[model samples]
Structure formats: structure tokens, C-alpha cells
Target: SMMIEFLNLRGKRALITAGTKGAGAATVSLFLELGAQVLTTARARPEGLPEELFVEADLTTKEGCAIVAEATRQRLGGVDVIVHMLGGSSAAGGGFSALSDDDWYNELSLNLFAAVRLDRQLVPDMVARGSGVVVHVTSIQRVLPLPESTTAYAAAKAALSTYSKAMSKEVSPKGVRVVRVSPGWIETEASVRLAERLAKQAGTDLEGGKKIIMDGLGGIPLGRPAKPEEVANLIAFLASDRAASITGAEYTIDGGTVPTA
Candidate 1:
């Protein structure tokens, strides 16, 4: 009974960013299934996003984070789990020359600062209450450092991972926990489109596109990318009471893509 209760989120409140699609959306779904009241924020609403309440805000800016923080407070009363999943790479081409000053700024603001800004508003209250979980969804590239298109992104996430660890050290004693989750390629719509685009670029089919992707990453031992739901399952367990002692560490879900720790 106690273990069951530990996994249950009956009275908890959770907030997830970038929940319109991808892993964010999957996490929201799993949270609801686990019995939590869920609120989410995204830049825009999706076509058929069920009946869950969603706040639309651009989380990449200070003003946007403030808007989301306030709206989340009003709607959910307060948050028990804060999931920062708003990140992506838009800088095209490869190598150091491909990125500009503006690209660096934009990537950092989205990948690093967005979570920092949101945590500023929500986490202190959790600290005061002496219990909560903050999950930063960083990427495996933060450690692997993919230079082709993710130099800025990798740098920003590396900063986020470091910051998340420091935040955990500070907050853990106060009863709040901060954790980082680094993911490799997940089978989301974005990845599907990326695979399609790559296939077209190389004048090959989608199967060849997958091969191209694996060759670039030096191949996954599992021979495939993960599903978004798989990553979400891990986040749900880590957020649950069963994972109370797990903090200040990163859980990587890359299908053995990342060779090192």
C-alpha cells in the first residue's frame, strides 16, 4: 500500500513546458494517467490536444516566463513538479563558422535561460513548502557535443546540466529536488520531419535517412531511436515518491548511443 501510494500522484500539481508536442506532451499524458492535476505551456496550441488546460506562452523570453509563471499559479494554485522541456536546434550547417552571435544568444536563451527563469518563479515556493521536483530535459549532445548543428545547443545544455546539479545541491536540503534528463533521438514528429528532410537532401528513402542519422551519431547499439513515451515513463517514475532519494544526477535515455558516462 505504501509503495502504491508512493507511485500515485493523487493530490499533486505539475507543470510542463513545450507540451504541445514531443516528450513534453507524452509527460503530460503520463502525469494525468498517474492522477496528477496537470498544466502545460507552449508557444501555441496543437490541433487536438484533448481537454487539459494549456497556457500558451513563449518560454524563451523573460516576459514569457513571467506570464507562464503567473498563469500557472492562478490555475494550479502551486506546482509540485516542474518539467522544463522547451529546447531545439534551429542553427543550420556545421562547425564553428555556422553559428553567429545571434544564434548563440537565441540558443542559450531557449535551452538554458528558459528553465532558469521559470524555476525562479516556481521553485522557491516549493522550497518553502519543503518538497517538489524540478526536471530539466537536457540533451545527450550536452556530453557528446555534436558539432554539426548543435554546437550552441550542446554548450547551452552543458551549462543547464551543471546549473541543475548545483541547484539540486542547494535545494535538496530544503526538501526540494532537481534532476536532469538527457535524451538521444526520440521518435517525435520533429524527428520524423528531420528524417524526411535528411532523406530528401541525400536523395534517398526514409530507411537510408535513418542509416544516415545513426552513422552521424556513430550508431545506437539498440539499432533505433527511442519513443517519446519511453522517456516520459522515466520522468514519471523519477517525479514519483519512489525516487525521493534520486537527485542531482542525470538519467540518459539514448538506446546506448552515448558511449561515455
Candidate 2:
């Protein structure tokens, strides 16, 4: 119970964007288990989400962000935590030329602006309270971008990381902390299904398929992609008082996927 209390978040208000899928959902899972009051968002409410815990917002636009911000003010009144987990790479194949101006704008709007606007809306409140935590979900691709698929995405993530580091230094002195969490090839349900499908097609076992995936990425020394809960645990710890001195940093939770700086 000693350590439990150290990470306890009872009565804390949290805002987690794009919480319907990926790492966002994982964070929500753990946050709910730990008793924090949560306000989560997506472009639309998924089929099974609790009505009270969700708000539909297209974070890529100012109107959408404003709606979410106003709802957050009314619902949570204020927030103690912020998790920006809504990002992905859809610009695949054809390399740099394939990324048109439209593509670049879309990528930046979705990946970087979403988080930036959300922080702008909520962080002022955090600074006023003299305490809060912001967890910006970045990706390992920012360091070793695969040009064919993730060039634009990686660039946006890189910008987000730098912004996070700068914002952290500004806010940590006010009792608020910010962190960038860069994950590599998280084992989400979509990825698991893809591995399984590949295994069936290639006449290999599921574990073997996983290895193929690792090999494609130059091999994961840990022998697997990171689990969602592992990243979740790291985020929860960073948000807790146990990491009071932690700020203005990037935590690479890639399980050795990134072999260099």
C-alpha cells in the first residue's frame, strides 16, 4: 500500500486525447484502474465507450479543439493531467515525392497541432494551480525515420519532441511537469492481427511472425515489441510524485528498438 499511495491519483482530473485507440487507450485503461477522473476524446465516440468519459472532437482543427476545451472546463472544471496520444503515420510508399503539400499539411495538423492546441487550452490552467503533468506521445521514428512511409510523420514528431522539451523547462519551475514518451513499434491489436495474418500466409508460427517483424526493424534485442501496459506504467510513474524531479526530458520506451541517439 505504500507504493500504491505514491502513485495514487484519486480525485485527479485528466484529459487524454484520441483515447479510443492505440497508446491512448492503454493509458486510459491504467488511469481508470487507478481511480483518476478522465475526459477522453476522439473524432467520434466508439461503440462501447462510457458516455460520461468521452467527448467527440476532431483535434486537428481549432473548432474541434475549442469544443473539447470548453467541455473539459465544464466537466472536469480543471485538469491535473494531460496525455496527447493521437498520432499516426499514413504517408506510406513513394518516399518524399509522395508526400504532397496536402499530405504534409494533414500530417502536421493531425500529429503536432492537435497536441499543441490542446496544451495551449489546458496548460494555462495547470500553471495556475502550480501542479500538473503533460505526457506527449512521440515515436521512435523521429530518430530513425523510414522515408517511404513515415517521413512527414517523423518530422512532425521531431517538432513535437522539441516543443515538449522547451515547454517542460518553462513549466517545471511552476510545479507542472512535461515529458515526451517515444515508443517503438508498440504491440497494438492491429499489429498483432497483422502478425498473425502474416504467420498464416508464410506458414510460420505467431511467435516466428513476431520475430520477422523484429528482424524487419533491424531486430529488437528484447525479442519483442513493447506492450501497451509497459508504456502505460512508465507514463503513470512519470505523472506521479515519485518522479517529482523528472522534467524537460524524453523517455525512450522502445525496448532497445532504437540502437542510437
Candidate 3:
């Protein structure tokens, strides 16, 4: 039910990394709604991706990114927008020891370096075309890290934030805009599964378990996790022409969960 009038991205070709689920799916849906030709990559084909244009690539590796970029160029001829919506922590129990060297590499590869590799290959095309937009989906943990459980994830995202700013500065003058969107807790299928697991483990109701999780994050001021569509709306605005002057910036959509300025 949210509305933004300048959210028209018709005729633009958008490639959404990790577009099969969560924020990635939301971004793809929104771009499709706005009439952009959207291409997406994931290890598997998710429901609702019409036809066969969904490129299946792991994107966590340089080879996978290359394949995806090549496929997008072949299918769309070029890209005008990119939404880096892939990334998640594999560490367990929210602690540093929960992860090993391999875990750190895997998390960073998926969360941060994937975007860097894609930008390295694709941004050149955007630069050559002299017009494009990129949005890196980050997390509030980068700024307010829950160290015990998310140190590697936070570090990876922090690197992502820095890289996004540097990329924005490099590309903005060449008519390419780069931005970041950091969402707080997003209520998705994964969240529901996590809540159910915690509920069973703690012998509490699902809702109660969810509240315990939120409370640990200092409780969302809005009293709930953000809906996926809400995050999508922000991405839609950033990728659209309306955000012409907005580049090298990061926007947090965490429902006031982050108390500091």
C-alpha cells in the first residue's frame, strides 16, 4: 500500500543477483511491476519466474559471476540497473567461534565479493553506456553488530558498504549511480522457519519466540519486522530515475530498531 509516484523504470533492463528469494525476490517483483526487463540468477529456479530466463549460477564464485554476466548480456543485450540482493550468514548461534576460516570465506564470497565481482564485470558496461544504477542490499548489523553471532557477517557487510561508496564515487561521475539499502529484521520464510525452530527449542509459542528474537535486537520501535515489500519499495525508488541526485548513500529501513543517529 505504499506509494511513490516517481517509481517508473520502464524500458530499463535490470539484473537482480540472488533473485530467487527473500529481498531478491521482492526486488525482482517490484522491478517487473515497474515495467523493467528483469533478469535474475540463483542456484535453482524459484517459483514465479516466468519462462526460462532465470539464469542458474552460484554467483559466489568468480566463474559463476562471469557466467551470469555473460548470460545477461546475451539475453538483455545490456543492463541498466543492478540490485545486489544476495547474502546471508552461515554462522550459527550468533558467535565468533561458530564460524571457521572456510565459513568466513564462504560468507564473504556470498555476501560481499559477489557484488564486487559483478560490478567489476558489469559496471564497465554501464560506464560505457553512460547510464545505470546499482543498489547493494546491506544489513544494520554492519553498523550495530551483534558480535557474538554475526561478526563475520557484519564484517563482510561493512566491507560491502565501503566498497559500494567507493564504487559510487567512481561511477557516479560517469553517469552510473550506486547506493546501499540496509534492512533490519525482515519477516520472510527463513524468518518464519527460524522462529518455529526457536519456539520448539525453547518450549514456547511461535509468536513468543519471535518476540524473544526481536527483543534481543532491542525490539523494533514499530513493534514488528519489516515486510519484504517495504524493502522492495525502497529498492524500486533507488533504481528509478527519481533518485537522480542520490548516490554513494546508504538508507536504513529497520523500523527504528537502531536507536542511535
Candidate 4:
């Protein structure tokens, strides 16, 4: 109870984008459990997620962001925290040359502009209120990008990191905290299913598939990808008052997946 009290979010309102599944869902659950009045988003309502808690709109479009912004205004009035957890890559296999202009645009729209436009719409209020938190869920791929599959995704995340830093510098003195969370591989349900399929394709097993994934990352010293709840916990703490002194920083939550020599 004491620890929960220190990290308490009672009465606080939070916005978590792409919260229909994985780490985003976990974060929303934790925030709600901690007493935050939470609003979450996705392109469509996933089965079993509460309708009262979700706003369905494609965040890749300006209009979509506008819709969510209006919903936030109506439902929560405003937010004390914004967790940008909507990012991924679906580019074709092959290096940079295989990427089309449309592919590049799609990557930017999803991985970068979604957060960019939403922040533009909502963060100024936080600045005016003189207190808020913005957590950008970046990726280790920004630094250790796999060119064949995620070059554009990496570039967008790198841009997001830079934008986050600049925003933090501009707002921290005004009482809003902006932090970048760079996660390596995380074992979400989606990833677990992917591993299962990979194992079947390779005529191996689940552990072998997971090992293949770790090997691709030069091996995770913590022995496996991070759990969704673990990353959610870190995000919750950073969003809480307990991290009052932190801002304009990128916290890597990859469990030593990216080696330092």
C-alpha cells in the first residue's frame, strides 16, 4: 500500500494510444488499477475491450487524431499523461531499395506522425496547465536498425527521439515531463504467436524459435524478451509523480539486448 501510495495516480486522467493490445493494453490496465481515469485508442475496437475506455480511429491520419482529440476533451476533459505506444513496421523484406515512396510514407504516418499530430493537438494544454507527462515509446531499432526490414521504422523512431528531446527541453521548465522509452524485443501475445508459427515453419519448437529471435538481436543477456507488464510498470512509474526529476531522457528497457563494448 505504501509503494502504491507513492506511485498513486488517483483521479489523474491518461491517454494511451494503440492500447488495444500488447504493452499498450498492459499500460492501460496498470494505469486503471492505479486509479487513473484512462482513455485509450486504436483504429478499430478490438473484441473484449470496454467501449467506454476506447476511441476507435486511425491515428495515422490528421482527421483520426482530431477525432481522438475531441474525444479526450469530452471524456476526460484533458489528460495528465499521454503514452504514445503506437508503432510498428510492415515493409517488405529487402534493403532500402525495395522500399517504395508509399512504404516510406506509411511508415512515417504510423510510427511518427501519429504521435506528432496528437502531441500538437493536446500537449499545449499540458504546458498551459503547468504539469503533465508525455512518454514516447521508441525502439532500440532506432540505434540498431535492421536495414532489410525496418530501415524506415528506425529512421522514424530516431526522428521521434529527436523530437521528444526537443519537446522535453521546451516544456520541462513549464512542469511537463517528456521522456522516450526505447524498448528492444518484448514478448507480447502477438510475438509469442509469431514465434509459434516460426517454430512450425522451421520444424523445431517454441524455445528454438525464441532462441532464433534472441540470436537475431545478438542475444538478450536477460535471457528473453521483456514482458508487456514489465514495460508497463516502468511507464507507470515514469508517468507518476515519483519520477518528478526525470525529463528529456531516453530510458532503454531492452534487458541488455543492445550490447555496449
- Highest-lDDT candidate: 4
The C-alpha TM-scores of every prediction are 0.95, 0.91, 0.95, 0.95
lDDT at 254 for candidate 1?
92
Clashing pairs in 3: 94-148, 94-149, 95-148, 95-149
Q: How many clashes in candidate 3?
A: 4
Off by over 4 Å in 3: 1-5
Tens-digit lDDT track of model 1 for 200-226: 999999988888998888899999998
Residue 194, candidate 3: Cα error in Å is 0.6
**lDDT tens digits, residue span 47-89, model 3:** 6677555899988988899998998899999999999999998
lDDT of 2 by residue, 28-63 (tens): 888888889999999878788898899988888999
Determine which window of 10 residues in candidate 2 has minimal summed lDDT: 1-10
lDDT (C-alpha) at residue 31 in model 1: 91
Please list the residue runs of candidate 4 whose C-alpha ends up more than 4 Å from where it truly belongs after superposition: 1-4
Per-candidate RMSD vs. true structure? 1.9, 2.3, 2.5, 1.6
On a 0 to 100 scale, what is the lDDT of residue 50 in model 2? 91
Model 2 score (lDDT): 0.87
Report the C-alpha lDDT of model 4 over 42-143, residue by residue, as the tens digit: 988878888989999999999999999999999999899999999998898788998999889999999999999999999999999999999999999988
